[PDB]
Amino acid sequence: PGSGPVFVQEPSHVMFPLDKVKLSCEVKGNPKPHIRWKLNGTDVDIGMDFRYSVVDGSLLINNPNKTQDAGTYQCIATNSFGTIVSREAKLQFAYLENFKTRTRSTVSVRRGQGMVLLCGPPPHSGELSYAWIFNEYPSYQDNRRFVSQETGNLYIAKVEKSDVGNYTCVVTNTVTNHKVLGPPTPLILRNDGVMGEYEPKIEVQFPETVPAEKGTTVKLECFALGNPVPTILWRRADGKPIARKARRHKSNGILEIPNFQQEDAGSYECVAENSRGKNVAKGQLTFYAQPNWVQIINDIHVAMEESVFWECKANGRPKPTYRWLKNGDPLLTRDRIQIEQGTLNITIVNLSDAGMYQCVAENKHGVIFSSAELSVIA
Numbered sequence: 001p002g003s004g005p006v007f008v009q010e011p012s013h014v015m016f017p018l019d020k021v022k023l024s025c026e027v028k029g030n031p032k033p034h035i036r037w038k039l040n041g042t043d044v045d046i047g048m049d050f051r052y053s054v055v056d057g058s059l060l061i062n063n064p065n066k067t068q069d070a071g072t073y074q075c076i077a078t079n080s081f082g083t084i085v086s087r088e089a090k091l092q093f094a095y096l097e098n099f100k101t102r103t104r105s106t107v108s109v110r111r112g113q114g115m116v117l118l119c120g121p122p123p124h125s126g127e128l129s130y131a132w133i134f135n136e137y138p139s140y141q142d143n144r145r146f147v148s149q150e151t152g153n154l155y156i157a158k159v160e161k162s163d164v165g166n167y168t169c170v171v172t173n174t175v176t177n178h179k180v181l182g183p184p185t186p187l188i189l190r191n192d193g194v195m196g197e198y199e200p201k202i203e204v205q206f207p208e209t210v211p212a213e214k215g216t217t218v219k220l221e222c223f224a225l226g227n228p229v230p231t232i233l234w235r236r237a238d239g240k241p242i243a244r245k246a247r248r249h250k251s252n253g254i255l256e257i258p259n260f261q262q263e264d265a266g267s268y269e270c271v272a273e274n275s276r277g278k279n280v281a282k283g284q285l286t287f288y289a290q291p292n293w294v295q296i297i298n299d300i301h302v303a304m305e306e307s308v309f310w311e312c313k314a315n316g317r318p319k320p321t322y323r324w325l326k327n328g329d330p331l332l333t334r335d336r337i338q339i340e341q342g343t344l345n346i347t348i349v350n351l352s353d354a355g356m357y358q359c360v361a362e363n364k365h366g367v368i369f370s371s372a373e374l375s376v377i378a
């Protein structure tokens with residue numbers, strides 16, 4: 001009996017469909033701690049007004065609207081012995097608007113030429129998925145036709161007499177699962193002559209720097225226009241073998257690296273080749289990791305006039321940075337409070353010091369919170 005608040009469950013980032021929403025957060029402690037919420041930093045008045053339902057800490061919003069709920073939430077729990085704030089949870093809303101036109105100018109191409117048909121997704125939020133339709137049926141993907149999942153563009157390495165007709169981009173919001181269709185774009189062949197042969201020209205490629213988060217699947221795209229139609233090949237610019245766990249898809253337009261690790265980082269190249277020559281694209285897969293607790297602060301009891309020492313340690317990439325909190329408020333160094341980075345030092349203690357403390361570790365990729373109680377003995 002007699003304990004400050006500790007989190008049993010904290011709020012998580014959310015991408016919510018606009019077609020309910022629960023922000024989980026539960027606390028234990030004695031006395032039973034009261035829970036409050038903060039949007040962008042301002043206390044949310046739950047009893048008034050909405051249909052907010054704070055069920056056991058967890059905030060419910062029973063009918064959402066983007067324009068007024070488009071920020072980051074924080075759950076704060078308080079009892080007699082002090083206050084702890086939870087990690088920040090970003091609340092975003094997903095949607096995909098319709099195209100605002102039903103037809104499109106025809107494009108006229110020389111047979112043998114490479115070409116790009118641009119999707120041009122409508123305003124949206126959340127991750128998108130893409131496919132194309134050709135003359136009423138799904139457009140076939142291969143060596144010569146590549147659809148980018150980053151942009152939705154359709155690439156034809158080499159236009160052939162079989163390619164004449166209508167092309168439609170079908171955009172899909174992967175989180176809401178709604179789809180919208182673009183305007184058909186008519187493709188016709190020039191009758192003025194044909195395009196001869198030329199060396200590959202890479203038109204879709206991974207960026208010059210591609211941040212790769214630890215433990216995720218990194219996907220690289222590479223595809224070239226050319227005549228004859230190029231072959232694609234992947235290799236590392238420092239001669240290191242690509243991992244055996246790496247797979248290739250879509251006639252080698254895509255290199256997947258599952259469960260990314262430090263050893264997989266480095267300069268990657270894709271090579272486009274045909275009989276007329278070769279083209280090389282390169283980029284740097286740069287490894288990064290959100291903070292993770294190595295050493296956390298823990299509850300501490302001390303006698304009235306004695307000293308205390310706390311240290312926080314977090315791994316991550318870049319290396320994490322440290323700030324401190326007392327009872328939910330920014331705590332900076334004074335007397336007898338000496339705080340340097342991940343260290344807190346109280347030279348002599350008084351009843352005033354007893355309370356909840358928090359070490360926060362952050363890098364440009366993430367923040368993490370830890371909390372402990374400091375009780376002082378009569």
Ligand SMILES: *[C@@H]1O[C@H](CO)[C@@H](O)[C@H](O)[C@H]1NC(C)=O
Binds near residue numbers: 071
């Ligand atoms: C919170 O801030 C973001 C911009 O930083 C804004 O988009 C959002 O609407 C804000 N939340 C509200 C509704 O006050």
Ligand SMILES: *[C@@H]1O[C@H](CO)[C@@H](O)[C@H](O)[C@H]1NC(C)=O
Binds near residue numbers: 106164186187
């Ligand atoms: C595409 O379809 C339209 C009808 O929607 C048709 O008139 C036209 O012949 C087709 N375009 C081409 C380039 O063949």
Ligand SMILES: *[C@H]1O[C@H](CO)[C@@H](O)[C@H](O)[C@H]1NC(C)=O
Binds near residue numbers: 064065067068
């Ligand atoms: C939220 O605000 C927008 C306009 O700012 C409006 O279109 C929508 O109907 C509103 N929804 C609610 C629940 O108030």
Ligand SMILES: *[C@H]1O[C@H](CO)[C@@H](O)[C@H](O)[C@H]1NC(C)=O
Binds near residue numbers: 309336337338345347
């Ligand atoms: C921290 O406490 C004080 C600074 O407030 C310092 O004199 C002392 O040596 C430090 N303690 C340790 C063990 O780091």
